[PDB]
Every structure is written in C-alpha cells, then in structure tokens.
Amino acid sequence: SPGIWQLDCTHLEGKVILVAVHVASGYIEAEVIPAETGQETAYFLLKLAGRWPVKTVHTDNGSNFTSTTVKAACWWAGIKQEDGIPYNPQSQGVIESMNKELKKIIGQVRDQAEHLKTAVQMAVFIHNHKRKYSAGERIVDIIATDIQT
Amino acid sequence: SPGIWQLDCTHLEGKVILVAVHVASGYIEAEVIPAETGQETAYFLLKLAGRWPVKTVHTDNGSNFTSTTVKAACWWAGIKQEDGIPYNPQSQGVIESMNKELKKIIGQVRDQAEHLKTAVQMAVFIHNHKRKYSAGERIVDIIATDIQT
Ligand SMILES: CC(C)C[C@H](CNC(=O)CCCCN)Cc1ccc2c(c1C(=O)O)OCO2
Ligand SMILES: CC(C)C[C@H](CNC(=O)CCCCN)Cc1ccc2c(c1C(=O)O)OCO2
Ligand SMILES: [Cl-]
Ligand SMILES: [Cl-]
C-alpha cells in the first residue's frame, strides 16, 4: 500500500502531461513531455523511484507495459510493474477527476508562467499542499509508519 | 530544520549537475542542465518545493541569490532564500565530499546508461537508498515528526 503508484497520461496545449499518483495519499509528481514514449516513461520512473520508495506501479497503458525500456527501468529500480486495468474501480474515475482537477489548477496558474511545464509544477505544488491533512502530509505519514514495520 | 535545503552545483562531462540536499537527512534531488542559470535554478526550486515542504534554501552562489527569477520562484513557493555561506562549517566540506561521493556513484553506474542525466538519476537512487537508516528513510521520519507539532 505505501509503495503503490499509478501512472496517468493526459493532454494539454498539444503536449503530454505524465503523472504519477501515490494511490493511498493522492500525492502526485508530474512532468511535461512532447509525447508518451517508453523512453520518457522509463526515465520518469527512475526519477520517481529515487525520490520515494516505489514498490509497485500500475502502468497507464499496454504500450508502456510492453516497452523494453520501461521493463529495464523497473528491473533496475526494483519496481513490480502491473497493469493499470481497474482491477479496483475506485481508481479509474478518480483519475479522470484528478486530470480534470489538475487541469483546473493549471488554468488558474497558467498566466503566471510563460511555459506549460512551469504551470504544471505550480499545479503539482498547489495539489500536494491543499489541506483536505494535505496529500504531501499523508504520503509522509504513510511511509513513516511503514518504515516502522 | 525539517525545512532546510542547500543548493549545490557541480560539473561533469561538460555539463552541470544541480543538486538540492536536505541538510538534516542527506537526502538529495538532482538534475542535469547545460549550465547554471537563474531560470534553471528557479524551475528546479519550483519542482522541489511541490514535492517536499521547503521552508529555507541556502543558495549556492551570489548570482542565483540575486537572480530575479530565483527570487520570484522563492516568493511564489513560500521559500526563504538565504546565502549558502558556511555560517555553519559542517556543510561546506560535507558538500565537497558529497560531490565526490555522487561522482563516484555516477562512475559506477555510468556504463549502464547512454545519457548522463539517466546516470545521475541512478546515482540519486543509490545515494538515497543506501543504509548508513537511509537518507530517504531519515527525511520521511524528520518531516513526519514535524507534522505533529
Ligand atoms: C534502465 C537502464 C538500465 C537502461 C535504460 C535504457 N538504456 C539502454 O538500454 C542503453 C544502455 C547503454 C549501455 N551502454 C536507461 C535509460 C532509460 C530512459 C532514458 C534513457 C536511458 C539511457 O540514458 O540509456 O535516456 C533517456 O530516457
Ligand atoms: C515563479 C513565477 C511566478 C515566474 C517565473 C518567471 N517567469 C516570468 O516572470 C514570466 C511571467 C509570464 C507572465 N505572462 C516562472 C518561470 C520560472 C522558471 C522557468 C520558467 C518560468 C516560466 O515558465 O515563466 O520557464 C522555465 O524556467
Ligand atoms: Cl526512497
Ligand atoms: Cl509538500
């Protein structure tokens, strides 16, 4: 549970926003890329896994699941790759709504930055800091508890 | 204390590695850029601050301290910008040695990746996971304790 993340890819301004969500907390990391490739996804996972203890990733589609580069990165980082098929239905609708909510925040900050990538990082900030505890607080508490086990 | 980070810039393969160290834990985040500019530093801080609760940053040099873009990003993200002058001497030598240690790990993984940026992320992974607790475990414990205050 503390180690489970879900990949999510959404589109804005002709570009792609790649998102990783920590399922138990709602905490996100995100980046802008020109298009979703196995190489970009693999690199994104390597960054994620050096920053948080990533045990399991629910991949966002079959092409990334199949990607030899994604597989290599998951092997390297000790990540168990899984399908993002809604084996659990509470995720797929929450993702749709997360994308909507993230895009809403992006629109709210968009005029404060020249580049989309900057607006996306501002939106990540706002998302992770917003008190319901915040997602940032929740992920830390979840993982801290897990270290004592 | 839980919110204090230090910026560090080091060189390898004709490129620049920008590093943020969580002082109390030794946890790092890092990125490769062609050269250190205020714009790159500002963007790096925006990413950092959306991921961890950054209260204070000891900037790595005077040009970044002065940078209007760095100042803007620190204002936006609620970061108190400080000089990285060794007001405390336990940092400057530990940074020199951290750069040496990071470069050592980079050399150990370098042949496993085509691009330097990838090797740097692998090195971040190894650094943050290495059990002394690991830096990754320490930062989480430090921040979790601070949330209860
Ligand atoms: C996850 C890693 C083990 C491999 C993985 C794939 N690279 C190779 O197979 C090339 C090996 C070069 C041998 N000299 C590394 C990697 C992943 C994602 C990337 C990469 C790289 C890379 O630098 O090779 O560049 C940017 O996006
Ligand atoms: C920290 C932010 C408030 C500002 C900050 C500077 N940008 C501006 O002043 C332009 C304002 C555009 C108004 N339409 C945003 C920023 C920081 C660092 C960057 C940036 C940007 C940006 O996208 O403007 O691009 C990549 O590196
Ligand atoms: Cl970690
Ligand atoms: Cl945070």
UniProtKB/TrEMBL annotation, chains A, B:
<keyword id="KW-0677">Repeat</keyword>
<keyword id="KW-0946">Virion</keyword>
<dbReference type="GO" id="GO:0006508">
    <property type="term" value="P:proteolysis"/>
</dbReference>
<keyword id="KW-0694">RNA-binding</keyword>
<keyword id="KW-0378">Hydrolase</keyword>
<keyword id="KW-0238">DNA-binding</keyword>
<dbReference type="GO" id="GO:0030430">
    <property type="term" value="C:host cell cytoplasm"/>
</dbReference>
<dbReference type="GO" id="GO:0044826">
    <property type="term" value="P:viral genome integration into host DNA"/>
</dbReference>
<feature type="domain" description="Integrase catalytic">
    <location>
        <begin position="1"/>
        <end position="143"/>
    </location>
</feature>
<dbReference type="GO" id="GO:0006310">
    <property type="term" value="P:DNA recombination"/>
</dbReference>
<keyword id="KW-1048">Host nucleus</keyword>
<keyword id="KW-0446">Lipid-binding</keyword>
<keyword id="KW-1032">Host cell membrane</keyword>
<dbReference type="GO" id="GO:0075732">
    <property type="term" value="P:viral penetration into host nucleus"/>
</dbReference>
<dbReference type="GO" id="GO:0004533">
    <property type="term" value="F:exoribonuclease H activity"/>
</dbReference>
<dbReference type="GO" id="GO:0075713">
    <property type="term" value="P:establishment of integrated proviral latency"/>
</dbReference>
<keyword id="KW-0597">Phosphoprotein</keyword>
<keyword id="KW-0239">DNA-directed DNA polymerase</keyword>
<keyword id="KW-0863">Zinc-finger</keyword>
<keyword id="KW-1262">Eukaryotic host gene expression shutoff by virus</keyword>
<dbReference type="GO" id="GO:0075523">
    <property type="term" value="P:viral translational frameshifting"/>
</dbReference>
<keyword id="KW-0511">Multifunctional enzyme</keyword>
<dbReference type="GO" id="GO:0046718">
    <property type="term" value="P:symbiont entry into host cell"/>
</dbReference>
<dbReference type="GO" id="GO:0035613">
    <property type="term" value="F:RNA stem-loop binding"/>
</dbReference>
<keyword id="KW-0472">Membrane</keyword>
<dbReference type="GO" id="GO:0042025">
    <property type="term" value="C:host cell nucleus"/>
</dbReference>
<dbReference type="GO" id="GO:0015074">
    <property type="term" value="P:DNA integration"/>
</dbReference>
<dbReference type="GO" id="GO:0019013">
    <property type="term" value="C:viral nucleocapsid"/>
</dbReference>
<keyword id="KW-0255">Endonuclease</keyword>
<keyword id="KW-0233">DNA recombination</keyword>
<keyword id="KW-1043">Host membrane</keyword>
<keyword id="KW-0229">DNA integration</keyword>
<keyword id="KW-0695">RNA-directed DNA polymerase</keyword>
<keyword id="KW-1163">Viral penetration into host nucleus</keyword>
<keyword id="KW-0460">Magnesium</keyword>
<dbReference type="GO" id="GO:0043657">
    <property type="term" value="C:host cell"/>
</dbReference>
<keyword id="KW-1193">Eukaryotic host translation shutoff by virus</keyword>
<dbReference type="GO" id="GO:0004190">
    <property type="term" value="F:aspartic-type endopeptidase activity"/>
</dbReference>
<keyword id="KW-1190">Host gene expression shutoff by virus</keyword>
<keyword id="KW-0167">Capsid protein</keyword>
<keyword id="KW-0917">Virion maturation</keyword>
<keyword id="KW-0449">Lipoprotein</keyword>
